[PDB]
Nucleic acid binder design. Sequence first.
RNA 1: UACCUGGUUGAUCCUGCCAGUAGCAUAUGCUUGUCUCAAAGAUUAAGCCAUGCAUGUCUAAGUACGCACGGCCGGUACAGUGAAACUGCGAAUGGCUCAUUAAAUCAGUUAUGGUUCCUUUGGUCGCUCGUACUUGGAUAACUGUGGUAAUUCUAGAGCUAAUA
RNA 2: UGACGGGGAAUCAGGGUUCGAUUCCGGAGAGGGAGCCUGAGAAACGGCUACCACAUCCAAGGAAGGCAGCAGGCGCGCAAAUUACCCACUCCCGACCCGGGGAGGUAGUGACGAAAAAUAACAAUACAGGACUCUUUCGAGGCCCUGUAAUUGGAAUGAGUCCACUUUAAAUCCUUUAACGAGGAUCCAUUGGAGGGCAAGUCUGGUGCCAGCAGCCGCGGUAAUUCCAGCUCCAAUAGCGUAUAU
RNA 3: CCCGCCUCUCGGCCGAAGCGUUUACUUUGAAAAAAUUAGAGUGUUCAAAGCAGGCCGCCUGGAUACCGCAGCUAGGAAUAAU
Lengths: 576, 180, 122, 255, 69
Amino acid sequence: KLTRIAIVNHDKCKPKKCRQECKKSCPVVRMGKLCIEVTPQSKIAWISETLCIGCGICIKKCPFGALSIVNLPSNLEKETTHRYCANAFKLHRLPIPRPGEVLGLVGTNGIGKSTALKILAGKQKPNLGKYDDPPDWQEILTYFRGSELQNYFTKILEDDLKAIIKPQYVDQIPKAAKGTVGSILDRKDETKTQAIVCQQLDLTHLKERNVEDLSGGELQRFACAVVCIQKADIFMFDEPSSYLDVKQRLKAAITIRSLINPDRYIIVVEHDLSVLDYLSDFICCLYGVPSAYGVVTMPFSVREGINIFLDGYVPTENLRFRDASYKYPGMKKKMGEFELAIVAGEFTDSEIMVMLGENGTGKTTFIRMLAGRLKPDEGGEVPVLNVSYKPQKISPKSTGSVRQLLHEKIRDAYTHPQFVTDVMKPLQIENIIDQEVQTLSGGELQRVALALCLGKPADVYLIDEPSAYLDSEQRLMAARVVKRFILHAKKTAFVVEHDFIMATYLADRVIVFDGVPSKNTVANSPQTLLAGMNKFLSQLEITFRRDPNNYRPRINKLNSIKDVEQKKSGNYFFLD
Amino acid sequence: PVARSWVCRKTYVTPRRPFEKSRLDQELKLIGEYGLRNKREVWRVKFTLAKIRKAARELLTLDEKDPRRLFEGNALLRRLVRIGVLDEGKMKLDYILGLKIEDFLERRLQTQVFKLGLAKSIHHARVLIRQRHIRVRKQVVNIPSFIVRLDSQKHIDFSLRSPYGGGRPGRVKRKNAKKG
Amino acid sequence: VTIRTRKFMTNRLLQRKQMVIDVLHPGKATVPKTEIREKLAKMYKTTPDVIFVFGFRTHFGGGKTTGFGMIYDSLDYAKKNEPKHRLARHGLYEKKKTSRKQRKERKNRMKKVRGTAKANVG
Amino acid sequence: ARGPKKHLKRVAAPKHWMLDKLTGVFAPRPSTGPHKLRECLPLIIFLRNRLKYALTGDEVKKICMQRFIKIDGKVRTDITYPAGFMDVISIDKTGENFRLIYDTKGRFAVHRITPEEAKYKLCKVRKIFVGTKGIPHLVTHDARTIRYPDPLIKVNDTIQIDLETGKITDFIKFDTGNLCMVTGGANLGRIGVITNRERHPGSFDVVHVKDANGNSFATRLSNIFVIGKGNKPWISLPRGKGIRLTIAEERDKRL
Amino acid sequence: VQLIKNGKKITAFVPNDGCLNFIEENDEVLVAGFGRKGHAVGDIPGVRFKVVKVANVSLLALYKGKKER
RNA sequence: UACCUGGUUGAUCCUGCCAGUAGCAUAUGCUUGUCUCAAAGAUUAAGCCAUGCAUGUCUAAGUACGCACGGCCGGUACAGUGAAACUGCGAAUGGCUCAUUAAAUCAGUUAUGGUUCCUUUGGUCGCUCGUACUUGGAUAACUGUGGUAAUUCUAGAGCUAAUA
RNA sequence: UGACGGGGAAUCAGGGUUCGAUUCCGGAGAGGGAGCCUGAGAAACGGCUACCACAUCCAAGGAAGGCAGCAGGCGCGCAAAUUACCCACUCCCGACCCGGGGAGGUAGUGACGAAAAAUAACAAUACAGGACUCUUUCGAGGCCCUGUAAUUGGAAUGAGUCCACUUUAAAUCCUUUAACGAGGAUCCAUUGGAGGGCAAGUCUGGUGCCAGCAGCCGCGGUAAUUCCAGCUCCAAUAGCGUAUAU
RNA sequence: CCCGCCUCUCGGCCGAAGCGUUUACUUUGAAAAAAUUAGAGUGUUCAAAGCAGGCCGCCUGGAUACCGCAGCUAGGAAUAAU
Ligand SMILES: Nc1ncnc2c1ncn2[C@@H]1O[C@H](COP(=O)(O)OP(=O)(O)OP(=O)(O)O)[C@@H](O)[C@H]1O
Ligand SMILES: Nc1ncnc2c1ncn2[C@@H]1O[C@H](COP(=O)(O)OP(=O)(O)O)[C@@H](O)[C@H]1O
Ligand code: SF4
Ligand code: SF4
Ligand SMILES: [Mg+2]
Ligand SMILES: [Mg+2]
């Protein structure tokens, strides 16, 4: 049974004129435990959130009716679809797929959004919340009885609707993929189109490098190609804006809608949600306590389902799930294919540097030569002291738990206090410190690897890509983590980002990577935040815009009334 | 708007005084004699005799040449001589009211299998009917409350697919006749 | 095993003969309709796939089975007059499966456009 | 209802169509036609339930679009076309002819007529007026409008028309002493010779009939259809010939 | 008991032996009449209501040991 | 099957009500092997609604120059199958609920001699004493240029029909 | 007025009394009110125009709304079902044999209710009765019947698994039939009761006006015919108990 | 139980017809939506139901009655008002 909570709005609740009938009618007040505390000298009633029993007595006893009853989510075990193990995560509901349109799934991380894909694609038979004695496919098809899906799963069981997924963990694919991009992509096409899939995804300039050659941006866009040529009907796109810049995110969004025949089944799952208005037609939402249970809501429309989620209150249920709305010279590397000619630029202490790049522009080569590796030109600065370095792709190899790995292999004599209250307590790795690092998903893997790179003392922090594999909620948490750490440690740091809202917030100083994308590159002298974004967004020819109330960066339509009047003045984003 | 019929009726009337010892005594005697299963099987026969007697008790207050009397009395007495509870000579409407409740219990198929010698006791007759052994002129009857009218009372035989009829004996003996 | 044919009406308007089949099969299961078509086609001097039977209900007790059957003049009158589910029981016909809900979604989506675009909006 | 109705449920249909209760929710509504809605047979009832030439409702349509069925010598493609009370329903593929005649229970019978007999019908003349430089018209009970009638014809008479042409061959005058059939109320279907008419100003007139058995009834004047002259009927009759036997003699005849 | 539906306050009798102990305060109970249709008698003064359920489990199932809290 | 029984007193006969007894519908508790039927968001809120769906239609017989397919064994107005749009018709029936309504609704009855009626079915349609071997102008489908963040929004340019 | 009207429903000796939102007819309305376009037919809402009220998207310039249709979720509640399949049926619409129909049909959840009806049968042996032709009594007979005993026995069969048929748009269920399937036939029938009303303990252990049962009368203060338990029994029986309208 | 000895205008040994104080009452007759309710027929395997079905192309059902009050009608003229 859902927990119900009494909810007061601020308007039409003027407490001086209506004689405080809500407090005097409540049963919990009439023992003396104060769920309601009002006075006639006040501006609002305050109903307590853990002392309300949710019994609905206070609602009818109000003169200017302002009091609503609102569900708060709980463990329900009502129409459970799949539970993974003993004392483990429980996926309650199944999403409904639809022909010929795109389905988006937004929410938090660790809530079950990839597990929903594996059940709808034939990759799992769910055990219906019963892990000892799993029911088999006959009795699964009598539990979705009276729904559409016991026809749809019958198409899965005889393979009348073929299901191919794009994997969430995109960095690990060349371990089962050997050779060249020309051979491994083109032997498995099974439709010889070969013409739109590269030009919509900016490819055939990467086709004689190896599959092991690519950095994480180009590693991502290869996998979007390998699902799209294939002949099937059911496609699931796991986090397709991971490791990508904004210009390639729109091209990935357009090609997903080029996979629509009206008989094809496309659902996607996003955490970026500024191309989601250009990417999907209907959006389901996943609430719950993270990794204890997750439930799928009903599908809402594109513009509708976002603004429902950003307030965090679902209107088709009455459920509320959230109340919150010093000098280095320039050099040439050429690894094997193309050079990056850095222009010699200045450098500071106790300031922040943000790399603004493209898919193959040289960000993960410039963060290596600051650690003193791969230096074929004479000169280039060596730092005096040891350096912290985060890798792009963390393929971990460890022993046992993270309490051996974090707490007794780096700073065994700890730096708490003060280490944990400033850094570790918002980063929330004390809950997952019991679990081993080898079973981890990509959200916790990225979150645990930052803890060492902040936890190491060094002079220059090489930090790259914190906005991979995380949700939208803990991406502004990382910003106050890094801003309050290095400007109170008085050291400086290299931060490397793809996301627009993260890179705008921190940046003291800006390093721009100009030139032709992935064929000849130049890293410019360090510019300011105002001209640095407004030059770089003139290289995208893409203009951003704040939604005025939840501060969300939204992208203008390409030739529009807002876009050409912003590209005229060159303010590609106001107040950077 | 559906293409249905919801027409149904109840076919027993529960007694008013529930614990009168004389009523319990007489109906338990009828249960134990005639091999009924519960008291609702007695009350249903009381309801059908009560409906018959209500029809005759309605017709008997008329002038005797009103044609509703002369048509429906002849039909009702013809059905009672057809099922056999009123004998062929005494077809007058005053002899409907002299029907006892043991007339319709004698014409059941269970009592007419026990009285026609096809069972060793009356409880053997009901368990013989319910196991698809008894047929009435090539229709295999699984109803112990089948009221046998007397152009079907003559043909009561064992089934053509039964072990006490034609052949193919049951699973007990054919598992028993495999010894090695 | 034994076919008896109850009331017979020869029907000159739809070019057939109309009858009610009695099938006595006292030691067997319900006989297939193919065997009934072979026995009645051996009875009425005609070929066995111009005759169509349906609706056979086995009576209670193991006894007779009673249904309908109709014997056409030729196969072309059968392809004009017989219902398409009853021809599709014979392999003479097959329906294209979408069947009802994808057609309805394609009907409500082809109302949103105009012109030649209704063909290239699916 | 903001307009006309187009459907008719099964339990609200006429009793004399003798429909089931469980075959479906709806009954066929008769089309608008010559005959009234409670007093007609559609063709889908007449071919599906009375004659059993077509088992399901699509096969009555497959019969009628092959131009098989003639109603009054005219080829009728509507399957719900109303017909009744000596519409001559003629099927020429099998050479049969049917005239719709009430049997004495009040139901439309399958009653067969001779192939020489199906060139005429009878019609009760309901309205006599003049028009349009003195042209006299005549309106039958199946709404045939005939110009230039015989000038002795008055209301409530019976004429006999040729079914090929539409022209009056001869007429019967309404009297005592003519044989009569009722198209009517509780005494629908009984055939007898007329004995009386009581004439009332301002209301329905009651006409007393005496049967071939001698039992008598009376109905309203709008229910009296004259069959013949004298005691000679001009049509083929049903096999009981309109004598209502009581439930006692009908049981004794079924015995 | 204070009723959810109209907010009036009643006094209800929790019938069987030891069935007081299965009740926490601030619970939903489903309260039926006492059997005499508006008149309050027994030997208990001014009480005409009795409790059937507590928190969607009935007091017979709690009392016999067939269900638990 | 036109029926009664316990309770005022030390005891009795009564007025009398309470409680019993049997149907019946709404819920709820405990229970459950077969099989034919079968009500099911009315009661309180005629309160609020995400999403799919619930009304469209082409014959021999209104208008095709879309190669969209296709005959002509090829030389002429058009073979034929036909997506689209114009046109005609249906969308006023069916469905759902019971909020208003107490001579209002509704029911039997009687009348339109005080009115309308698409459709069907019969009548009428050289009754009139005054370019015709067939007349005009356009606009859609189509082609082409675009706007708008946003709709089953539609604007400009060029064609061509009619049972418009 | 917790009032849509009627055909009707539950009770019923005759009379009455009460109920009818509800599948047929007739009316009214599509959030509250208005006002209109087309049309033969509307004051249409799966049409339009505003006002009120509430709500969605927005580039804050604007755009679109109406489940008292089928399913579904919110909420209120003591109180009510699956976002399934199809035009085979029954009919309606259309220019029409040909297309369409959450109208309808079909399945699912379903102890609201209604009809049928399993949960053993028979033969032994032993014991007890019964009447006995014999027997004043001890004592007889399968020279005759009735009951019991977790004391034996081989005959019958469906619950159920499940090839097929058959049903049907295509499946399902029912019916037919092939193979498996019964000893304690653990393949284990429940719900209320035993003072009177009211069919059934004048039993064994606990508590000792406390806990409680009790519709009423009443029982409970150390032989409780009433509480809490066991045994036995006794109504009803695939059902019965309680609460409210009647 | 039924009629008879003890109204007038006139139409083919008068059917037809000028009409007589009203009504209440009664008895027949017309018209009274089907479904439900009594009810006839018929072995859904019995039954609740259903309108089917039966005989070796043929035969035959899908009845009937009640529907109060008000209206309409012809027979009666005790009892009751004027
Ligand atoms: N082992 C190798 N052999 C040959 N060429 C390589 C190898 N590794 C990298 N490259 C090339 O050098 C370039 C280096 O890529 P870079 O590190 O700039 O990408 P990145 O900055 O990580 O991209 P993003 O940051 O968008 O994920 C790539 O374009 C790649 O083609
Ligand atoms: N085999 C498993 N064992 C334990 N937990 C699992 C298993 N599979 C999935 N989970 C849990 O299910 C959740 C799935 O998260 P995920 O689908 O990655 O969400 P998202 O991709 O939206 O971040 C994780 O929190 C994980 O703990
Ligand atoms: S909710 Fe209660 S206390 Fe608050 S303003 Fe309203 S009446 Fe006053
Ligand atoms: S929900 Fe209950 S506890 Fe909370 S304010 Fe209302 S009456 Fe009080
Ligand atoms: Mg995922
Ligand atoms: Mg990178």
